[PDB]
Amino acid sequence: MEHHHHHHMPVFHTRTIESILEPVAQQISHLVIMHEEKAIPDLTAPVAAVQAAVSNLVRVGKETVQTTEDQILKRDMPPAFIKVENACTKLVQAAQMLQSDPYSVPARDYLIDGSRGILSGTSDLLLTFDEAEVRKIIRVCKGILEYLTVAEVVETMEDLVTYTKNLGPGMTKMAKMIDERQQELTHQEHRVMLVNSMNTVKELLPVLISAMKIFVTTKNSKNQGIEEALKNRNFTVEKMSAEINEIIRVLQLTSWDEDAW
């Protein structure tokens, strides 16, 4: 005689998203936690606002699907509005059976299920809008993993003065983004290999930037051996690019989600 069973159906990955649905999450499981197997007031005036904000959400959510061209989002968002949509009709509908009778046990369960909707539904809503964010972050890196290759074409010293002013700011934004991400991550492993990585990239910047200038002035003189100077360059790049990918790959790990191919 072996028995084991409980509830299910609630995902979560981002630190913020959790500290937003976590409460309503434990509340639901705690309301069903009474697994031993009391009347209900009038939830008419407190379920109408949950339907209110829920509407505003779909609103600001349906507009975001009209701006950001993130296709994978423009197609992953809609189904969400559907979830919260009907998940609400139950909440509002459930509140009725309880108003017409606040002792009904199917309603208490019916009510929870509907709430479990707006939660599970809003979850995807944020989750999706989030993966899209981790995306914009990848784009930034992809563009920083594309410019470095441009170093291998900087001959004139004057250009070096237009490569840094450019590469710099890029790495700057490519740093703040990573900083925030690590905070949002819910796994120690990722947070680490993600930070220490973006770390070397910062140090390797003032380096390749030198090998670039050291070469731009060495070729200007009879100083033969640009190899030991040039090689040092591309070598640094190759190191940065190899590191930058660890970031991307890591992010994509925390990115590619079920809804995705």
């Binding site: 913020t16 309503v24 509340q27 939830l43």
Partner: peptide, 23 residues
């Protein structure tokens, strides 16, 4: 504004499930 309106309904909902019990 998403993370906002979301948190909004999150509470607005958390305020409803509160009338479902309090021990």
């Amino acid at each position: 504004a998403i993370y906002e309106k979301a948190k909004e309904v999150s509470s607005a909902l958390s305020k409803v499930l509160s009338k479902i019990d309090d021990t």
